[PDB]
Design a protein around this ligand. Structure first.
Ligand SMILES: CC(C)(CO)c1cc2cc(NC(=O)C3(c4ccc5c(c4)OC(F)(F)O5)CC3)c(F)cc2n1C[C@@H](O)CO
Ligand SMILES: Nc1ncnc2c1ncn2[C@@H]1O[C@H](COP(=O)(O)OP(=O)(O)OP(=O)(O)O)[C@@H](O)[C@H]1O
Ligand SMILES: Nc1ncnc2c1ncn2[C@@H]1O[C@H](COP(=O)(O)OP(=O)(O)OP(=O)(O)O)[C@@H](O)[C@H]1O
Ligand SMILES: CC(C)CCC[C@@H](C)[C@H]1CC[C@H]2[C@@H]3CC=C4C[C@@H](O)CC[C@]4(C)[C@H]3CC[C@]12C
Ligand SMILES: CC(C)CCC[C@@H](C)[C@H]1CC[C@H]2[C@@H]3CC=C4C[C@@H](O)CC[C@]4(C)[C@H]3CC[C@]12C
Ligand SMILES: CCCCCCCCCCCCCCCCC
Ligand SMILES: CCCCCCCCCCCCCC
Ligand SMILES: CCCCCCCCCCCC
Ligand SMILES: CCCCCCCCCCCC
Ligand SMILES: CCCCCCCCCCCC
Ligand SMILES: CCCCCCCCCCCC
Ligand SMILES: CCCCCCCCC
Ligand SMILES: CCCCCCCCC
Ligand SMILES: [Mg+2]
Ligand SMILES: [Mg+2]
Length: 1173
C-alpha cells in the first residue's frame, strides 16, 4: 500500500487537513477499492506504542510501593495533552469575548446610538480576524486530542494481550470470554473521542469566571442572581451523573453473562439445530435481556434530564438575572440582548461542557483502574530447569484444582505418583475414565502446580491435546505453527500421519482456509492435524494425550507403527492409550485409578502378577405516534409564539424602555430564547427516549431469531468474531448512543425550523437571506457522506479480526504455552490492531476535514455579511443590517444541527448492519414403527460443490439396530446429518410412509434423537443442560443419571444438580461429557435415534454402560449406531460400509471382514476371537 500522506505534506496543508482531499475526490464517483487505504504513520504502529508503555509500566512496578497505571501514562502522553490544552483554551476565550464585538456592531444600526457607530468599521475587521483565528485554533487542537487518544487505546490494548498470554491456570475459570470482549468493546470507540472533552474540567471554571466578570459590567450587582440558578443546576446535574453510573455498573455483569452464552450456542449451532433447541435458547437470552433493558431504561430516564438541562435554562437564566435590575432602574433592550448573548455561552459552558468533561474523567479513569487490576492478576510461573540428564522423573506429587482445598492441606486429583523414563521409553498411561490422565500431563507442563513432590525434565516439550484446536489458516499453517517451512520433514510427517489420502480430496490439495475450530474438517481429520503439529516440532518430551480417539482400527495401527514407534523411536514420549496392543510395545506402564497409582512397571511383570431511517421508524408502531405527538405540540408552541410577537408590535414610565427605531431588538431577543420556548419537556422527551429503546429490543429479538434459523451453508461463511462484534458492540450502540443522539438531533432540528418559520412570517426576507447558506450546508453534507459512510463501514468491519484472534488465543491457550509461541501470536495480534487503526485514523481525519469546512463556510458568509451591513448603514435606520445579521445568528445553531446529523448518520451504520442479519434466508402418533426407506439420496455441503454422497439407496426394518462404519473422513457424519437435512440434499427419505415435504421441517426433525460428535455444553446448571425446556422433574433426572452412571461425578460438586458450569464444562472430563450427552438422549424418548460416536474415548470398562443402556432403554426404537471400535459391532445387525462416496449394506459381520483382509488383520486379538468363534 501507499505511504501515509502525513509523512510528506505541507505545513499549511497539514494545518487545514487538505491531505484527505484525494480520497474524498476518489470516493465520490466510484467505490473505494483496497488500493486506496493509506498506511498508518510510523509513529502509530502498535509495536512502538507497546514497547513504550511496557517500558514505563515495567519501571513503575519496579520503583514505587503502590503502582498505578495512570502514573505510567502521565510520563508518555501528558506533554502533548497539555500542549494541545492551551490551544483549546485560547479557542474558548475567543468565543466568550465575541459578544463584546457582535453586540457593539448590532447596536450601531440605530441613529440614536452615535457612540458605537463611529468605530463600527474597525470592529468589522476585528471581528473578521477573530473568526479566522478561532477556526485555526480550535479544530487542530481537537484532532490532536483524538490522535493522542488513539495512541493510548492501542498501547493499552497491547498490554492486555501481553498479560492474557501469561494468565495463571486457576484464574482462567473466573475470566470468561465475555469479560474481555465487554472490556474491549466498551472502550473501542468511546475512549478516543473522549479525550476531546477531557480539557473542559479546567477550561469551564475559567469560562465561568471570565463571563461573570464580563456580565458584571452590564448588571452591576444583579448578575449573581442569575449565577445562583446555574450553580444549583450544576449541583443537581452532577447528582444525576453520579446516579447514572450506579445503574451502569449493575448492568456490566448481566451483559457479560449474555455475551458468553450467545457465543457458546452459535459456534455449536449444528448441535442446536439437531436438538431443535431454537426456542429454548431464545427464551434463555430474552430472560437475560429483560433485566439488562430494565436497567437501560432507568439509566436513560436519568440521562435525559442530564441532557435536557441546557434547553430548559435559557429563559430562566435571562429572566432571573435581569428582573432585580429592571425593577430598580429602567432597562434598555440594548442591554437585554447583550445579556442574552453572554448567557448563550455561559449556559453551554456550565451545563453542556463541564458535566461532560467530569463524566468522561469518571469513565476513563475507571477503565484504566480496571485494566490496572487486570495487569496485576496471578501469572503463570515457569521456574524450571533448562539442562539436565534428559531423564523425566517425578516423585510424591499431589495436586488440587481448587485452591482452597490445597490451602487447607475433597479428593486430591492425584496422590503419591512417581515414574521415571530416561531417553526414549514409551510410557503408556492408562486407566478408567475420570481417574485422571489429562491432569497428569498438565502437572508435567506446569499448568497445575503440585502442592507436594518434585517434577524434573528438559525444557523442550510438545503437546497433542485430547481436544483438538485448529487455528484459522491453511493446513500448512496449522502444521508448521510459526516456524521455517522444511519441505522434507513436512512430507515425512504427513506421510507418517497418512493424511495424503484425505488431503488429496481437497480442491487446493494443500491450502484450504479453515474456519476457527476446524468445522470444515471432520472429527478425525482435526485429531491427526493436531498430532502432525506435535510431531513436526522437535522436543525432548512428547505428550500424546490420546490421539487415537476418532480413528478406526486400521488407521490407528498404521499411524502408531509408522509415526510413533518408527519416526521418533529415540525421543521420550508419554502416550495415553486404552488399547491393549499399545501396552505390549511400552517400556513403562502406569495404570491410574481415582488418582492413585494402581500399578507401575514393565508389561512383563504386569502379566507375571435511504430506506434505513424509514425501516427503523416503521419497525415499531408506537414510534410514529410519539413523533406525531412531538410534532403536534410543536405546532401549538409555534402558533402561540407567532401570535405573541404579532400582538406586541400592534400594541403601544414603563419599566422596559424602548424607542420606535430600536424596536427591532425584539426579534434578536426572541432568537436567543427560542431554544426554551421550543424545548421538549418531559411530556415529549421521556416518551421518545422510552420508545427508542424498545425498538432495540425488537431488533435484537428479530436478529437472533433469524440467525438461529439460517441455513448452515450461510452460517459457515461468517466468522465467529463478526457475530460477536454485531452482538456486543452494535447492540450496545442501539441502547446507549442512538436514543439520546437522535433526541438531540430532533430537538435542534425543531429549534432551527421554528426559529426560521416564525421570523419568516413576520419579516419575509430573512428566509431569503439564509437560503444561500442552508443550500451550501446541504450540498457539502451530501458530498462528504458519500465517503464517510464507506469509511465508517470499513472501520466497523475492521473490528472483527481483533475479536476472532482473541477468541482463538483464549480457546487454545493451553497449546500456546506448551509450544512457547507467544511472540508469534503477539506480532500477529499487532497486525490486526494496525489494520483497524488504518481505517479508523483515516475516517477520523476526513470527519475533521468536514468539521473545518462546515465552519469555514459559515465564517466566509458571516464576514461577507458584516461588510455589506456596515457599509449600507446610511443616515440612520440601517434596515439591511437588521435583516442580514439576524439571518446569520440562526446559522450559529444550524451548524450545531448539521454536526449532530453527521453523528446520527454515523451511528445509523450500526442499524443497517443489524438489518443485514434480519434479511438472511430461511432454510424452510406418527413415528409408531420407525421403518424408513432411502431412495436416491445425494448430499453436498455447498451448492455447486463436490458431492460427498451420490445416489445412496438403502432401507432398514423397524426395531432393527444398524451399524454405520467406514474409514475416517469417508462421509459417516455427513450421512447422519443428511437425515436431519442440515446440508443441501436431493432425493427423499420417508418414515412409516410419509415423505419429506409432506411434513414441516421442524416436525420432521423432532422424530429423531441425536448424539452429535462434538458434545455441546453451555454455561448453566446441570438440570438446565439436561433439559432446557424444564419438562422433567428431578426424580426422572436422577433415575436416568443412575442408569448412565453420572451419579458419582454429579454428587462430587457442591451443588448437586445446581452447580453452574463454566468454560463450556471444563470441570468435567471428556468421558463425563459423553455420558452427559448419553443421558440427554435417553431423556428425550424418540422412536428413532442417530448416534454419532457415543464411545469416543471410553475405555472398555466404561463401554459396558453404553451397551447396557442401549440394550435396555432403547428397546424397540431403531438405532443407527456410528462406531469405530469393533466390540460395538456385536449388537447391530445390518452394517452400512461407506467408501468412495457410496454405501453398501451387509447382513453379517463375517462377510464384511472376509471382504477386507487388511481391515481384519488390524483387529485386536480380544475382539478378533469375539467375532470369529
Ligand atoms: C498535575 C497533576 C494535577 C498532579 O500530578 C496531574 C496531572 C495528571 C495527568 C493525568 N493524565 C494525563 O496526562 C493523560 C490522561 C490519562 C487518562 C485520561 C485522560 C488523559 O483524559 C481522560 F479523562 F480521558 O482520561 C494524558 C495521559 C491524570 F490522569 C492525572 C493527573 N494529575 C493528578 C495526579 O494526582 C495524578 O497522579
Ligand atoms: N479444570 C478442572 N477443574 C476441576 N476439576 C476438574 C478439572 N478437569 C477435570 N476435573 C475433574 O478431575 C478429575 C480428573 O480430571 P480429568 O481431566 O483429569 O480426567 P481425564 O484424564 O481427562 O479422563 P478421561 O480418561 O475420561 O479423559 C475428574 O473428576 C474431573 O471431573
Ligand atoms: N462443511 C463442510 N464443507 C465442506 N467439506 C466438508 C464440510 N464438513 C466436512 N467436510 C468434508 O467432508 C468429508 C467427510 O466429512 P466427515 O463427517 O464426513 O467425516 P467422518 O467420516 O464423519 O469423520 P470421522 O470418521 O472422523 O467421524 C471430509 O473430507 C471433510 O473435510
Ligand atoms: C480569571 C480572569 C479571567 C478574571 C477576569 C476578570 C475581568 C473580566 C474583570 C475583573 C475586574 C473587571 C472590571 C472592574 C471595573 C470596571 C469598571 C466599569 O466601569 C466597566 C467594567 C470594568 C472595566 C470591569 C471589566 C471586567 C473586569 C476587568
Ligand atoms: C481543576 C480545578 C481548578 C477544579 C476542580 C476539578 C474537578 C472537576 C475535579 C476535582 C476532583 C476530581 C475528582 C477526584 C477523584 C476522582 C475519582 C476517580 O475515580 C474518577 C475521577 C474523580 C471523580 C475526579 C473527577 C474530577 C474532579 C471532581
Ligand atoms: C429570585 C428572584 C427575586 C425577585 C425579587 C427581587 C426583590 C424585589 C425587587 C423589587 C424591590 C423594590 C424596592 C423598592 C424600595 C423603595 C424604597
Ligand atoms: C398563548 C397565549 C396567547 C395569549 C393571547 C392574548 C390575546 C389578547 C388579545 C387582546 C385584544 C384586545 C383588543 C382591544
Ligand atoms: C488571556 C485572557 C485575557 C482576557 C482579557 C479580558 C478583557 C475583558 C475586557 C476588559 C476591558 C473592558
Ligand atoms: C482578546 C481580547 C480582545 C478584547 C477587545 C476589546 C475591544 C474593546 C474596544 C472598546 C472601544 C470603545
Ligand atoms: C478607536 C479605535 C478602536 C479600535 C479597536 C480595535 C479592536 C481590535 C480587536 C482585535 C481582536 C483580535
Ligand atoms: C492542571 C492540569 C489539568 C487539569 C487536570 C486535573 C485532573 C485531576 C484528576 C485527579 C485524579 C486523581
Ligand atoms: C468568580 C467570579 C469573580 C468575579 C470578580 C468580580 C470583580 C469585580 C471588581
Ligand atoms: C444575500 C442577499 C441579501 C439580500 C437582502 C435584501 C434586503 C432588501 C431590503
Ligand atoms: Mg482426558
Ligand atoms: Mg465424523
Amino acid at each position: 500500500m501507499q505511504r501515509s500522506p502525513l509523512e510528506k505534506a505541507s505545513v499549511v496543508s497539514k494545518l487545514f487537513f487538505s491531505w484527505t482531499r484525494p480520497i474524498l475526490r476518489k470516493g465520490y464517483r466510484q467505490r473505494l477499492e483496497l488500493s486506496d487505504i493509506y498506511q498508518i504513520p510510523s509513529v502509530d504502529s502498535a509495536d512502538n506504542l507497546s514497547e513504550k508503555l511496557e517500558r514505563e509500566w515495567d519501571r513503575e512496578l519496579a520503583s514505587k510501593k503502590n503502582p498505578k497505571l495512570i502514573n505510567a501514562l502521565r510520563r508518555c502522553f501528558f506533554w502533548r495533552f497539555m500542549f494541545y490544552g492551551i490551544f483549546l483554551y485560547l479557542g474558548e476565550v475567543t468565543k466568550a469575548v465575541q459578544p463584546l464585538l457582535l453586540g457593539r456592531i448590532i447596536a450601531s444600526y440605530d441613529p440614536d446610538n452615535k457612540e458605537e457607530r463611529s468605530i463600527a468599521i474597525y470592529l468589522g475587521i476585528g471581528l473578521c480576524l477573530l473568526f479566522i483565528v478561532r477556526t485555526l485554533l480550535l479544530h487542530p487542537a481537537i484532532f490532536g486530542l483524538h490522535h493522542i487518544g488513539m495512541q493510548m487505546r492501542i498501547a493499552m490494548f497491547s498490554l492486555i494481550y501481553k498479560k492474557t498470554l501469561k494468565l495463571s491456570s486457576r484464574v482462567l475459570d473466573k475470566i470468561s470470554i465475555g469479560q474481555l470482549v465487554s472490556l474491549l468493546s466498551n472502550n473501542l470507540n468511546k475512549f478516543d473521542e473522549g479525550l476531546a472533552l477531557a480539557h473542559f474540567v479546567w477550561i469551564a471554571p475559567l469560562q465561568v469566571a471570565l463571563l461573570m466578570g464580563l456580565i458584571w459590567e452590564l448588571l452591576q450587582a444583579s448578575a449573581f442572581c442569575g449565577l445562583g440558578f446555574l450553580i444549583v443546576l450544576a449541583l443537581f446535574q452532577a447528582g444525576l451523573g453520579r446516579m447514572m453510573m450506579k445503574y451502569r455498573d449493575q448492568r456490566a455483569g448481566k451483559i457479560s453473562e449474555r455475551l458468553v452464552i450467545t457465543s457458546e450456542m452459535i459456534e455449536n449451532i449444528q448441535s442446536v439445530k439437531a436438538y431443535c433447541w431454537e426456542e429454548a435458547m431464545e427464551k434463555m437470552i430474552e430472560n437475560l435481556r429483560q433485566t439488562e433493558l430494565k436497567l437501560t431504561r432507568k439509566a436513560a430516564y436519568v440521562r435525559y434530564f442530564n441532557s435536557s438541562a441546557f434547553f430548559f435554562s435559557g429563559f430562566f437564566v435571562v429572566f432571573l438575572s435581569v428582573l432585580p435590575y429592571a425593577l430598580i432602574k429602567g432597562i434598555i433592550l440594548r442591554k437585554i440582548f447583550t445579556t442574552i448573548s453572554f448567557c448563550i455561552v455561559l449556559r453551554m459552558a456550565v451545563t453542556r461542557q463541564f458535566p461532560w468533561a467530569v463524566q468522561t474523567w469518571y469513565d476513563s479513569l475507571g477503565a484504566i483502574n480496571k485494566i490496572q487490576d487486570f495487569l496485576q492478576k496471578q501469572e503463570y510461573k515457569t521456574l524450571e530447569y533448562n539442562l539436565t540428564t534428559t531423564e523425566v522423573v517425578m516423585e510424591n506429587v499431589t495436586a488440587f484444582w481448587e485452591e482452597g482445598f490445597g490451602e487447607l492441606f475433597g479428593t486430591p486429583v492425584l496422590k503419591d505418583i512417581n515414574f521415571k523414563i530416561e531417553r526414549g521409553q514409551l510410557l503408556a498411561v492408562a486407566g478408567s475414565t475420570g481417574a485422571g490422565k489429562t491432569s497428569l500431563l498438565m502437572v508435567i507442563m506446569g499448568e497445575l502446580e503440585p502442592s507436594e513432590g518434585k517434577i524434573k525434565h528438559s525444557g523442550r516439550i510438545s503437546f497433542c491435546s485430547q481436544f483438538s484446536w485448529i487455528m484459522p489458516g491453511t493446513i500448512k499453517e496449522n502444521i508448521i505453527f510459526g516456524v521455517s517451512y522444511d519441505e522434507y520433514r513436512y512430507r515425512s510427517v504427513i506421510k507418517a500421519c497418512q493424511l495424503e489420502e484425505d488431503i488429496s480430496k481437497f480442491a487446493e490439495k494443500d491450502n484450504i482456509v479453515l474456519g476457527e475450530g476446524g468445522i470444515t474438517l471432520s472429527g478425525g481429520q482435526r485429531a491427526r492435524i493436531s498430532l502432525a503439529r506435535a510431531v513436526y516440532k522437535d522436543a525432548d518430551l512428547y505428550l500424546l494425550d490420546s490421539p487415537f480417539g476418532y480413528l478406526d482400527v486400521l488407521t490407528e495401527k498404521e499411524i502408531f507403527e509408522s509415526c510413533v514407534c518408527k519416526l521418533m523411536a529415540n525421543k521420550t514420549r508419554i502416550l495415553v492409550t486404552s488399547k491393549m496392543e499399545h501396552l505390549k510395545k511400552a517400556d513403562k506402564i502406569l495404570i491410574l485409578h481415582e488418582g492413585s497409582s494402581y500399578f507401575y512397571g514393565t508389561f512383563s511383570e504386569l502379566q507375571n502378577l435511504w430506506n434505513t431511517y424509514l425501516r427503523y421508524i416503521t419497525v415499531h408502531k408506537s414510534l410514529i405516534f410519539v413523533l406525531i405527538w412531538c410534532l403536534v405540540i410543536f405546532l401549538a408552541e409555534v402558533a402561540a409564539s407567532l401570535v405573541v410577537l404579532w400582538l406586541l408590535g400592534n400594541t403601544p414610565s414603563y419599566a422596559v424602555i424602548i424607542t420606535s427605531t430600536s424596536s427591532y431588538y425584539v426579534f434578536y431577543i426572541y432568537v436567543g430564547v427560542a431554544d426554551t420556548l421550543l424545548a421538549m419537556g418531559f411530556f415529549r422527551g421521556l416518551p421518545l427516549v422510552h420508545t427508542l429503546i424498545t425498538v432495540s429490543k425488537i431488533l435484537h429479538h428479530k436478529m437472533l431469531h433469524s440467525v438461529l434459523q439460517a441455513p448452515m451453508s450461510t452460517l459457515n461463511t461468517l466468522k465467529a468474531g463478526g457475530i460477536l462484534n454485531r452482538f456486543s458492540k452494535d447492540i450496545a450502540i442501539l441502547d446507549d448512543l442512538l436514543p439520546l443522539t437522535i433526541f438531540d438531533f430532533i430537538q435542534l432540528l425543531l429549534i432551527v425550523i421554528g426559529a426560521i418559520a416564525v421570523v419568516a412570517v413576520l419579516q419575509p426576507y430573512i428566509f431569503v437571506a439564509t437560503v444561500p447558506v442552508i443550500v451550501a450546508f446541504i450540498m457539502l453534507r451530501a458530498y462528504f457522506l458519500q465517503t464517510s459512510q464507506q469509511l465508517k463501514q470499513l472501520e466497523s468491519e475492521g473490528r472483527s479480526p481483533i475479536f476472532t484472534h482473541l477468541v482463538t488465543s483464549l480457546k487454545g491457550l493451553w497449546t500456546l504455552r506448551a509450544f512457547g509461541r507467544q511472540p508469534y501470536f503477539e506480532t500477529l495480534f499487532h497486525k490486526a490492531l494496525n489494520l483497524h487503526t488504518a481505517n479508523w485514523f483515516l475516517y477520523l481525519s476526513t470527519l475533521r476535514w468536514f468539521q473545518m469546512r462546515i465552519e469555514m463556510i459559515f465564517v466566509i458568509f458571516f464576514i461577507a455579511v458584516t461588510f455589506i451591513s456596515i457599509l449600507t448603514t446610511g443616515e440612520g435606520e440601517g434596515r439591511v443590517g437588521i435583516i442580514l445579521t439576524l439571518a446569520m445568528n440562526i446559522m450559529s445553531t444550524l451548524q450545531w444541527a448539521v454536526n449532530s446529523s453527521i453523528d446520527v448518520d454515523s451511528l445509523m451504520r450500526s442499524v443497517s448492519r443489524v438489518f443485514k442479519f434480519i434479511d438472511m434466508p430461511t432454510e424452510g402418533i406418527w413415528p409408531s414403527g420407525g421403518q424408513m426407506t432411502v431412495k436416491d439420496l445425494t448430499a453436498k455441503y455447498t451448492e455447486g460443490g463436490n458431492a460427498i454422497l451420490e445416489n445412496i439407496s438403502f432401507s432398514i426394518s423397524p426395531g432393527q439396530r444398524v451399524g454405520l462404519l467406514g474409514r475416517t473422513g469417508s462421509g459417516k457424519s455427513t450421512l447422519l446429518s443428511a437425515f436431519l437435512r442440515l446440508l443441501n440434499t436431493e432425493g427423499e427419505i420417508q418414515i412409516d410412509g410419509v415423505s419429506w415435504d409432506s411434513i414441516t421441517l421442524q416436525q420432521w426433525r423432532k422424530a429423531f434423537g441425536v448424539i452429535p460428535q462434538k458434545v455441546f455444553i453451555f454455561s448453566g446448571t446441570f438440570r438446565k443442560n439436561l433439559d432446557p425446556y424444564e419438562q422433567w422433574s428431578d426424580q426422572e433426572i436422577w433415575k436416568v443419571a443412575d442408569e448412565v452412571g453420572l451419579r458419582s461425578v454429579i454428587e462430587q460438586f457442591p451443588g448437586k444438580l445446581d452447580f453452574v458450569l463454566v468454560d463450556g464444562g471444563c470441570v468435567l472430563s471428556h468421558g463425563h461429557k459423553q455420558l452427559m450427552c448419553l443421558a440427554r438422549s435417553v431423556l428425550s424418548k424418540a422412536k428413532i435415534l442417530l448416534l454419532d460416536q457415543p464411545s469416543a474415548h471410553l475405555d472398555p470398562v466404561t463401554y459396558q454402560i453404553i451397551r447396557r443402556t442401549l440394550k435396555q432403554a432403547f428397546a424397540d426404537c431403531t438405532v443407527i449406531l456410528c462406531e469405530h471400535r469393533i466390540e460395538a459391532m456385536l449388537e447391530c445387525q445390518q452394517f452400512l460400509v461407506i467408501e468412495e462416496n457410496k454405501v453398501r449394506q451387509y447382513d453379517s459381520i463375517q462377510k464384511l471382514l472376509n471382504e477386507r483382509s487388511l481391515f481384519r488383520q488390524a483387529i485386536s486379538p480380544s475382539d478378533r476371537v469375539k467375532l470369529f468363534p
